[PDB]
Amino acid sequence: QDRKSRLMGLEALKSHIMAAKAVANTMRTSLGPNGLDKMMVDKDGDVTVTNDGATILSMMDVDHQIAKLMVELSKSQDDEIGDGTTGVVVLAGALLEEAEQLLDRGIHPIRIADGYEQAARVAIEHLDKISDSVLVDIKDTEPLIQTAKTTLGSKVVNSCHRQMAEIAVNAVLTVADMERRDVDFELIKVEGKVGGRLEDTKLIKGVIVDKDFSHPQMPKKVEDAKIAILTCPFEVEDYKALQKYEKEKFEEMIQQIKETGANLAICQWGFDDEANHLLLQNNLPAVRWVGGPEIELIAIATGGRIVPRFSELTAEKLGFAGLVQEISFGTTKDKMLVIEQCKNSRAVTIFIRGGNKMIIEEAKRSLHDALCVIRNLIRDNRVVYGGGAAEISCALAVSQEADKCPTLEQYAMRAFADALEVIPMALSENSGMNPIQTMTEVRARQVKEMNPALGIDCLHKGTNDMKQQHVIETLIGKKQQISLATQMVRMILKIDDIRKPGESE
Amino acid sequence: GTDSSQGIPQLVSNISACQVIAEAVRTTLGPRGMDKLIVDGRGKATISNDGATILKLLDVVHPAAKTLVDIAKSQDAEVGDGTTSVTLLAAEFLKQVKPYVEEGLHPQIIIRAFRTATQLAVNKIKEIAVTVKKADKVEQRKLLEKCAMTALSSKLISQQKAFFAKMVVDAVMMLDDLLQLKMIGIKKVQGGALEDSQLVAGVAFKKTFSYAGFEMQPKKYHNPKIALLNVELELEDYQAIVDAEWNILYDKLEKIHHSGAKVVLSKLPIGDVATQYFADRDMFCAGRVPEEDLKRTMMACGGSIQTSVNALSADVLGRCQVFEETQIGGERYNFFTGCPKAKTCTFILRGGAEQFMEETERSLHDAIMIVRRAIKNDSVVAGGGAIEMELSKYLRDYSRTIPGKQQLLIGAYAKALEIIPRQLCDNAGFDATNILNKLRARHAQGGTWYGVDINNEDIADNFEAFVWEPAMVRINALTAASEAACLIVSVDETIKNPRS
Amino acid sequence: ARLTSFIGAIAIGDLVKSTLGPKGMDKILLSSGRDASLMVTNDGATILKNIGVDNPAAKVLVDMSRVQDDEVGDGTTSVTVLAAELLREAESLIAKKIHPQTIIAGWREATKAAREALLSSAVDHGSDEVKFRQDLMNIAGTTLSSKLLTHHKDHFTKLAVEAVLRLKGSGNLEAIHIIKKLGGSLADSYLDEGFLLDKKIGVNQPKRIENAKILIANTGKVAEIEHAEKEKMKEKVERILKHGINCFINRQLIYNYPEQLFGAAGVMAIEHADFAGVERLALVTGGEIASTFDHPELVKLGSCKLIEEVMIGEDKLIHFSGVALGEACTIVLRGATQQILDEAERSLHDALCVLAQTVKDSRTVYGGGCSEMLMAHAVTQLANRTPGKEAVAMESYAKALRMLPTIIADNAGYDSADLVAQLRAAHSEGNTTAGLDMREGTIGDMAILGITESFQVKRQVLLSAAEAAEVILRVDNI
């Protein structure tokens, strides 16, 4: 009955470090290709299972303000690249949990933060030094197959992993621009369809709309290029008069459309099925009750633009179609709408027909991060061998640098070395082997041999060298990860008090 | 409560309350002090370094806390530089005089001693302040920028800081009309590097879905003026409503040539899905604009304001110099530069790393504040807690001369003046007592312009370190702190009148 | 959150544990006392469908069980109890600080060995080779265990054997319908070819029709507008008068005034028939399903050959004999209680399904737990061979496989610590031809007993149980 709400600076740092080690060391087990995935359950009605650290931290709700800060900026980093979020979170947690002892030694947090920044600069220059990157990865269709083994090696999708690798290389080729090297929101390679199997996610460069048909007797296969999109709304003998007025309004779609040239002009709202059959005899199909945001999707099949208004419809800006093909989109369900006849889609999207939901999310996230690594590969063909080998090399380098260093920067970089060493222990522990023995052995081997690719083999393969295992990570991704982790530890060390209006002493 | 009664107990309680309020801003002193997180209820946590911002958003309820906060806010409003110093100094005065209160020292004696000590200190400052304004600051500005980069010395921006300093002071000199922080605003853009950061004499705002509709505007247009529209732009009686909607849509195009406005502004959402519909209009548009951009346009270019659907005015396309729309980091940004009253300078915060907003807003803002304050005044004194040490030494030497009650009180005042350098070297993280002892020795015997160095954590001659602070602002800060302490001391009762 | 999820899955498995085998205990389907008088069922599959589940891992396990149920055959109880045993063993191994990844790897490389051992001992039945019926007899009997319809089981097996040549093209299962009423005995099963809907005009309508083209209806001073709508409806019924159809699905409600006109037009108004019969007519006879009838005039109509309405046995026993295809073999029993309906429906559905995969995949293995002991022996042999900590994993897999028929033994009330141990020791020499029999409560050569289970459903059980156990084990938090 004598609670107090005072938060002095050092105990505030202790509390913040406790909160950080709570949000960390929780998703730590998910690090690595065989990390223990986290089953996320919604607080009301949803349950899901996933292994991506960014996803689990994004769904998870955190009460402490420090955790909210870290997770929201991890969201920002995921938006920036989308890889290494797990590494960033676990590394920041490691730094804080091992700098707690430096704080207990009496060091001021500002000194620790500046020493950590110096250590980060040392690590950056060291990792830029030991890069054995390959620069031929532009016309590398065959090497690109083994580039993405690591990001797809966690499941049994290897049966048809080469098919989706070829799909991905075709996708990057059809948008390969040497000037900007970017992909926008409209060019999204995302569409989830339930039902199917692994190989059912095949290469189709077209427009996909899961709406209904114009008429059950209407021939689904059409080739005329006069496709169009319109927002035609549904807007006592007065009822008969209104019906006649609506018919006269739609007469522009029957008669006064020949001079305009809009045959396949689908509708969006309520309609009378009689005029649909009249147009069927007139050979002018029109899909009724289509979705809202599908106007742009169906009008991008040849890289054109969106024309949903009546008077704005022109022959030069008619509907667009992808490429002629005659395959049943629905084996058991009715066929999906064919909008593929004419020309390649600049906003190219590949059909996905996986048979499991979790398969759908894993496939789309693998495609997303494969595109992310490639978009880095074309902007900067620089890669490094990860798997904890780079972290071990950086830790040894910064431990070397602590031998010729001023005082509190010396202790800070000594702390930073042990903090960097966490990634190999996390990987090995997630692999099930001895967390400390294997890391020490690989560290001794990496100081004996000048090879910097001697990491931790979590897949229980032959050797600790990932040059044969094709375990590869880009310079930019690792650089951003380490720099952001250092920025996190610095800024969290800067904070010394949190005050909330509405005190309850 | 706890002994809120006549005389001594209430003064003790008020002193304790002032100590509590100062403890909330104690560690933010210095250019590289700590930082605070404040949550504003609904969950918008606020992070900031400056003390005045922290004080302005506190939840003070205690009368002593309120009557110190108002003094701090008045000091901030009168001069923007130095708010956490006056509160901290006043709280130190109160805490140093508190152990003399319960012994029966009548608070009127403390008031008189504080006033005479403050008068002596203000007199003493005038014999030490040195005029440097004429010494090559307006013309041959090398000294100005040499003082300017001190806010960025010994950091990662050490090599490039000269460029930013020289260029921002170039902007300042041509806009020397009592510049303000609000009307000199900077904007952050994703991507790029730090070396190529540039300053547009205007505004820099990215065009979003609801910001601007039509692209590829006529940039090379020499009379662009803003048109502030206040009506929507984007698209029995069941057909009457359709007819009315179509008539409204047709009437929305009556401003294309009849009104004659190149750029139109609105507070209602703008639809980029109808860009081709706006492409028929073939003119630039603005929507969901921030108030900063609005004010900068009004006092720079002078855009017209429209209320009616067919509001026609002669200021729709008045005289403004140039229109600029250049992609920044792969994204098109709107620049309403080229204005007859273009007293605006928006800085492009180019950079690949996105988290540098706090770094740039703590660095360049302080740098330009130092530049402006050095330009405004003529005479300055050594900073970094150097003038405080000199005042403390002089007051301690003078106190021993006078006989009577005032001697102890002036001595306590001089002791309380030492807290500024102590707090600086404490926030810097180094052993405060050693720095203070070395400073006191070398400052009583050797020289009168030694403060604390934040880089190497040692005493230094801040005069040749080019750490300048105007004499007038320091004098005003000291006077305000002493007067706040006196006002607290002179009060010994509170009256509540709770309900009836 | 590993311990709580593991205990939840273990409890879910234990709840169905007692129902394994053709001796399982009965369960009470209780709820709030509003409508919770008494419901009892021996089968554990229907128990899971009516379980209030809270643990999300238990939700995943129940969803997997539902997948097994609506997939081929009935093995859901076996799959669930096997998963429960596997997670119990996993909890035991975690108690001795064994990392889940090593356990999962060992479980994978033991599941592959068990599956290949099951492939090794598969034996092809003669019903698809030399036309034996006793193998069909046994395969029908084993899946129909814990039931009572053994009197007219001959009719069931007749529909089973007659399916392979007529009722399926590649294993079709939608051509068979089951319907029954209240009041009867075990001697009520008979062959039908349609539903039990009677004419509504009266007694003057002839029983026999000419030809049926069956489709689905569309619909059923405002007085002037109502009269205009009535005139349009009369025009519509006049248009259907010249259609010449004799059967027609009336999805929407029709009152008497157009009902007599439908009868006089030769169009029978089938008042909102169950869509199951409509689907059966669709694939057997050729009556498509549409939304409106005005557009179909002469080419978009149905297709049928002969339909008659008769009354047999005091009930509306209409026999839709003479449709285009003779695959619409409908069984019409006469039950006594409400549970007879669903019980017979699910029993016949599961038996017909397992018969479909037997005629699709003719290889099979002996049931009664001998195959389980065979896979357990194979994985135990594998475990003794490879080093590493996964040895504990495969031996725990073997322990779960051994415990799977121990539950069957216990549910019969017999002993369990001797005849299971006796079976295990014999299985090294008294090989796969051996087995366990609940008729006598002893170990005998299972082949002479003849009770065998189709290989496909057994492999599906093993794969699903291993996959679900691995998925639940892989979860560690939340």
Ligand SMILES: Nc1ncnc2c1ncn2[C@@H]1O[C@H](COP(=O)(O)OP(=O)(O)O)[C@@H](O)[C@H]1O
């Ligand atoms: N085959 C492998 N061998 C060794 N280490 C691997 C392998 N695959 C992934 N890793 C490690 O797993 C870590 C996480 O990789 P990734 O999944 O790309 O990032 P995130 O987990 O943040 O999504 C990386 O640091 C990488 O070193």
Ligand SMILES: Nc1ncnc2c1ncn2[C@@H]1O[C@H](COP(=O)(O)OP(=O)(O)O)[C@@H](O)[C@H]1O
């Ligand atoms: N580079 C520097 N070296 C030494 N002292 C500094 C330096 N920069 C600022 N200071 C000290 O910081 C004090 C002002 O800081 P602060 O009060 O936090 O900001 P503000 O005055 O805007 O509230 C001054 O007394 C000055 O002596």
Ligand SMILES: Nc1ncnc2c1ncn2[C@@H]1O[C@H](COP(=O)(O)OP(=O)(O)O)[C@@H](O)[C@H]1O
């Ligand atoms: N008469 C019998 N003799 C031997 N074993 C039987 C007999 N009936 C059932 N079994 C065994 O019971 C197991 C299935 O039991 P249960 O779960 O009740 O049926 P279902 O798998 O259809 O749910 C099978 O593995 C089978 O070997």
